[PDB]
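Hey forum,

I'm writing up a methods section and want to include a predicted complex as supplementary material. The small molecule is fragment of triton X-100. I've pasted the protein sequence and the SMILES. Can someone with a working setup run it? I'll credit the forum in the acknowledgements.
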Amino acid sequence: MDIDPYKEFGATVELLSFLPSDFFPSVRDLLDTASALYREALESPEHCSPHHTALRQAILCWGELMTLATWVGVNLEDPASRDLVVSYVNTNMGLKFRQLLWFHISCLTFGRETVIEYLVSFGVWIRTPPAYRPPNAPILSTL
Amino acid sequence: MDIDPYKEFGATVELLSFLPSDFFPSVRDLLDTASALYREALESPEHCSPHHTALRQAILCWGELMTLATWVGVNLEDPASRDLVVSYVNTNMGLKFRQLLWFHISCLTFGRETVIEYLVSFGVWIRTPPAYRPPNAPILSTL
Amino acid sequence: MDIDPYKEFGATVELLSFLPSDFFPSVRDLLDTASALYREALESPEHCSPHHTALRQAILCWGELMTLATWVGVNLEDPASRDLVVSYVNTNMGLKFRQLLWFHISCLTFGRETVIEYLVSFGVWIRTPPAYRPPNAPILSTL
Amino acid sequence: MDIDPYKEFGATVELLSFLPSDFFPSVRDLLDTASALYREALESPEHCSPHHTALRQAILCWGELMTLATWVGVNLEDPASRDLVVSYVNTNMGLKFRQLLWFHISCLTFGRETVIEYLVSFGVWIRTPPAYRPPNAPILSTL
Ligand SMILES: COCCOCCOCCOc1ccc(C(C)(C)CC(C)(C)C)cc1
Ligand SMILES: COCCOCCOCCOc1ccc(C(C)(C)CC(C)(C)C)cc1
Ligand SMILES: COCCOCCOCCOc1ccc(C(C)(C)CC(C)(C)C)cc1
Ligand SMILES: COCCOCCOCCOc1ccc(C(C)(C)CC(C)(C)C)cc1
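Reply by user p_vandermeer:
Happy to help. Structure tokens for the complex are below, copy them as they are.
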């Protein structure tokens, strides 16, 4: 069905399309950030928040995809297809996964209002042509 | 990390493997049920329930897996590897996905207490000898 | 030392001497039932109950016996004696293990009074000849 | 289930590994002690103590193992396999059995605090180099 994984929280794929695809940190970086800030809450038997309830499932999906990639690499004796599949995973599913991880980790760390205002402001910045684009882009911070 | 997709809901993979893998309905049946009964809520911008959140994320993951399988069927030439990947997906990931969808739908419908009692009773039943167990398999009913 | 493992609990080998060998689930089934229902309590540092203590000790005994059977299969080169010892172990020791595990699990699940009354009634039933006893044995179930 | 038979009593397999394997007395000696000191309590119909429960179960297991050994000696004819099985049973299984019997008897007789302090002191001793290791090895006493 047509499910948006953000409108449950107050955003949309059209609002996160302000951020380009080359903007999102790597999956390793984001998973390390999660392990750092919310490992004890993701490994807890509590609905601490919908962000947790969703981030757990996203991490489980990524883990299943990694198991798929290993299984492919070990079973399939066709390096061409092996590489094709692994690259497709790590690129497309990686992009989607890190979009979702960015959104959740940010709305947890900083806040819904702050994150939405940041998306709007970054859209302003990235629509503004370069000749009039300040260099001090918007950068989420607690400082 | 060490995340259990059930322990925030009060269960565990050890408790759901207590049932056979040949018991859980097909993914198509479970998705049709989910649509029929909770489309207006899964397509809603509300934290209706942790079950709704987790189920949205699971459905998104299954959609991405289906896209992967279709992309494989299109691009990958080697039919052996292609069919092998598709079969692995639909079998392993299918089993996990339908276990989780069964859990979530059944909870939303009947109750967590009911579903856990059903897991326990059905496991004990299918493990008990027939001459000393009730002859008709347990089943969940709102009727 | 003339010990009865059930006298401490209110039963006797003479009360469970009627339950046939086909009345008890397999050892794997009973161990799975235990791991599903009371794993977090058997792996706990608490004197949760005498049933938990006895279950722990019985499971350790069975683990050591399975270790013995494996060591036999690995270190004995006479298949006759090897299979004979493994068969003795499984059949006899697992019959006793099934008796004990069943008693403990059923007590924990239903109740001491319930289980003792069920044993009395099953004895009444199994002592009666088939020409005068009902064909459907008594049944203990949460359903 | 990965169960530690001392966790519910306040110890661990790594706290008892301070004690060597050549430290624990013969199973005959330990069973003689157990008889002399707690026969009427082990044969009793009471949850006198979790120690008594575990001791009853351990004694039942040792009895079943002795029965296995006699059955082997009488049925099996291959002297190699017969002696191998009996020797493995005695050495290994009785080593574990006398570990557990020592723990339970000692706790019942002296005290939990006393036994734990004895384990740590014996660790101190067996770790201390010989040139500074007093010959008066630690020993349990009620005096
Ligand atoms: C290739 O990237 C396209 C960029 O546009 C993204 C549009 O989709 C929005 C995000 O959608 C999803 C879909 C699925 C997922 C899940 C949770 C299933 C994770 C995944 C992709 C790792 C399987 C996350 C986000
Ligand atoms: C072949 O599977 C054997 C049984 O697996 C038991 C569960 O394994 C632990 C992880 O379980 C899940 C369950 C569901 C899922 C989701 C919902 C994310 C869907 C899936 C399987 C399509 C990735 C992921 C992991
Ligand atoms: C062959 O079995 C016949 C049925 O048993 C008749 C006597 O029943 C008494 C059962 O006594 C025991 C003895 C030992 C045990 C332990 C706990 C030691 C377990 C075992 C048999 C797995 C070693 C349990 C019950
Ligand atoms: C070969 O022994 C090696 C040393 O043992 C290390 C600790 O092992 C953990 C399990 O310990 C026990 C101890 C006793 C027992 C009982 C009492 C059940 C008796 C036995 C060994 C006869 C089965 C079971 C497991």
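Some notes you might quote in the supplement: Chain B is about 65% helix and 0% strand. Helices of chain B lie at 13-16, 27-42, 50-75, 79-110, 112-127.
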